[PDB]
């Protein structure tokens, strides 16, 4: 993904918004015939979990607990998951040696149950204001409803019947003179250790304190398990109910697991001329493909193009064997030996075929970029078939063109 | 119905959380770390192409709705707090991102000043908003914002950060750790905005009116021989590990004065209240004066509220404002949440009102049909 | 380089046995307790100490040069002892990297010159970036990237790690041959 | 006030003119590019060209919809929130306040003066806005001179030249003897 530079050769997406992304990041949509990007697809929320103590919490409990773990804590000074140490328990960090004793929080007899965050200072005033505005909003709703049904009736405010407990909040008292800056600030050395930085100030927003002794450790933030759903298609992919300590997908779907992935095996000279060898591995068990197209003339956004890649080669039938094969186990005649193609095809191993592209570098100053279209026989299986019961000839016949953009090192 | 989310996109920091809460859940720098870019690009930028702005806001809102808040965007409503006279194309884009990409049920474009008034409970009050870009004031009288008597000056965070950078480069004394124990000037051509902001918050403070008025005349040096008050002690600040910048005591209490300096025009952060209040209707004068509100993170700076209220009462006695605003009692309101998170708290208090929210707010079905967001400009 | 893995020619001196290749330059003081079941690679000047260990490594494990894998000591009131670490399947430890980690999960790409702290657990399908410090007793979830001197959540990985990482470690092993 | 309200709309387009010097170039922007639409609602729905204006420094600014919806506040000052009649209203009200016999002749003789009538399509809008308020089938002639800005002075220049002016003005010795009223009583 990162070790090999997947962020070089990119695949194009069809729709409203055109995007150039690596095949590793993209997803293939099986309901229809069009691969779509992580940007294009809509995101959902499945499950919440703590990154320290991996515990799958339900959606209801998260809303009550404000998307936080009760047991785990993150240090305020540096941003790292704290650890309980005994002597009878105090909270301490590994990276920085900030303790819970420093700020002056008393040690608890019970390990987890004892620790808590103080109640918000303006929580009582809050509820009183909500209830005042709630009652006041309810009056406007009744007024707006009464006005709307009178318009809908269209009786011109005809008086058939006779027309027409209060909550009163006291408004906050305005101070005559606000407290001045203490005379300590004048003629006193300022230790930058004692006062807190903006980053660690703002992590505790309810009462962001200037001094470090006031700054208490906040609960550790819960992380999210994303599930993707498309515009045209319904489902796409999702994750299990035990995503904590699991790398399994409930429905595995990705562009590399359907569309044939292209990789630049060899990179030649960048001095005005060369011959680059690229591989075209298949992922499907049995299929056919072809890199025939030259991306037309000024069509399909070929603005990035800074070279003329010929790739004048007819289709080559490659197949993947999901099994541990030996070094040159058997030599097939019709697949390998019959299309010898010594100039075009470099090598043909198991689920692998090297192809020579004749690029024209140094058309611009530098940063050589090549546009070429790749075709493949997509066994869609859109119609109802149990273990390939249906023939799926019309599906296999369908030729899907992916506009690839390979970027040479330069 | 579900508890509607509140977002407040600012140049420096964005406030995020859920309605009917004591304060915002997440507050973070309004930036995004794009691959290739060493410094992260700012998400809100006025006067750029729509497509480039659309991509930045799409990237940012995604981070807010998944990494910071954990909730589906399509399920529950939005309460977008944005200041009055926010650029047209920016607000149009922000809504278009929420309605098209995320497919939110309904957005409510509340003005920050009217939201700040709800938190106190008082129906009428003057509201000063000392933000990053511009320090804006807007009188709110019994629910109606008075756009006629608006006021704004560029004396916020950005103007203060720039002033600090200028002063530090003049009196530049850093200990690199390479025979740089001796005072070394301007080793680095520019100082990054992240450092300048941290220096401002920790080192620099707002002086008293009496001491400040002397500092103004001192640096001017208006036919006087060393008429400055005794500064605080010099604070040593680390830059990128090894390099230790010695911050001069004069810089700490002089950097702030650019806000409260008259500069001939008679245009300070203090004057902007009195300039607006004098332009207000004659009946509204005494009610607005008595109910002052000071929101924005720039006013959090230690001893700002005392200097402002003092500087007001001094500028009152000045002959221009002496006639109209002579015998007026200026009293400041202390909001429940902190000065930074007053704007957000209003939107949450408003978001808790499910019945009024749905009616006032613009539904997606209306936007998809029309493609016209309602504004204070003509329809 | 552009998806394709590049050639690396090894010298004559290297201990090739049952698929497992271990550079003779690289000392592994404590050969008894350390175990390499699969076709593992250990590059030159690397350390795998047997300080009361049980260092089990993967099928296609890779450890680049100047890199150390030492077990951590558990500060227990009952008895202070070195906790035996278990490197997962298809694990890629990058060059000049320090590892004091207990239980490193399968299909992981540990970055270059990155110090992992004492008693540090890593779950499967994660990636630590280069010049990063994971503090003692930290956990990293699957499909995650931890970075910075603090060592905290930077973002998420590509969905296809389980399938992709197999190609990387196996290709490197296959491409890494004698001169 | 139109210059002040244009500055507000220019900040709503995203261009600040905070300084007192920068207020002068807002007055220049107004004087250069600001056209009064006959129907304001139709021009708002229509997508603007966004005509570029060049500043003294050299920088370009796209004004867009602020161009036409700024001077509209003359004809409809309730939009911003200023309690006034309006330029179309004050003209009609002034005629309607006068005696019934003169109304027809006063509608038949209207003269535009000053600089805040030179707005492009001012006469076109005013004629339309006056007609609907004024009585039906009444002849409304809004006779603008070519020198509207300098009309007030030219009048004084003609008045001053006449021998009657010699009687009208107040002498320095008259002001010393008569008192303060001298200037007020001789005014008319
Ligand atoms: N707690 C604080 N203490 C001191 N200064 C602060 C604090 N929070 C923010 N600031 C400063 O004041 C500014 C407040 O800007 P803010 O109101 O968050 O942005 P915006 O005006 O774009 O909504 C910040 O840029 C920062 O420089
Ligand atoms: N060509 C013009 N187009 C639009 N507005 C103009 C034009 N010329 C002047 N103005 C406006 O009219 C003002 C001039 O008013 P003026 O006629 O001098 O008033 P007075 O009659 O009191 O002397 C300018 O400040 C400007 O706002
Ligand atoms: Zn689809
Ligand atoms: Zn936890
Ligand atoms: Zn810490």
Residue numbers in the entry:
A (entry chain Y): 2 to 88, 106 to 182, 219 to 464
B (entry chain J): 12 to 390
C (entry chain V): 1 to 179
D (entry chain I): 189 to 376
Question: How did the manuscript describe this experimental structure?
Answer:
Dynactin is a 1.1 MDa complex that activates the molecular motor dynein for ultra‐processive transport along microtubules. Dynactin is built around an Arp1/actin filament, which is capped by pointed and barbed‐end complexes (Schafer et al, 1994; Eckley et al, 1999; Imai et al, 2014; Chowdhury et al, 2015; Urnavicius et al, 2015). Dynein binds dynactin in the presence of coiled‐coil cargo adaptors, such as BICD2, BICDR1, and Hook3 to form a highly processive motor complex (McKenney et al, 2014; Schlager et al, 2014a). The pointed end is important for binding dynein‐dynactin cargo adaptors (Zhang et al, 2011; Yeh et al, 2012; Urnavicius et al, 2015; Gama et al, 2017; Qiu et al, 2018; Urnavicius et al, 2018).
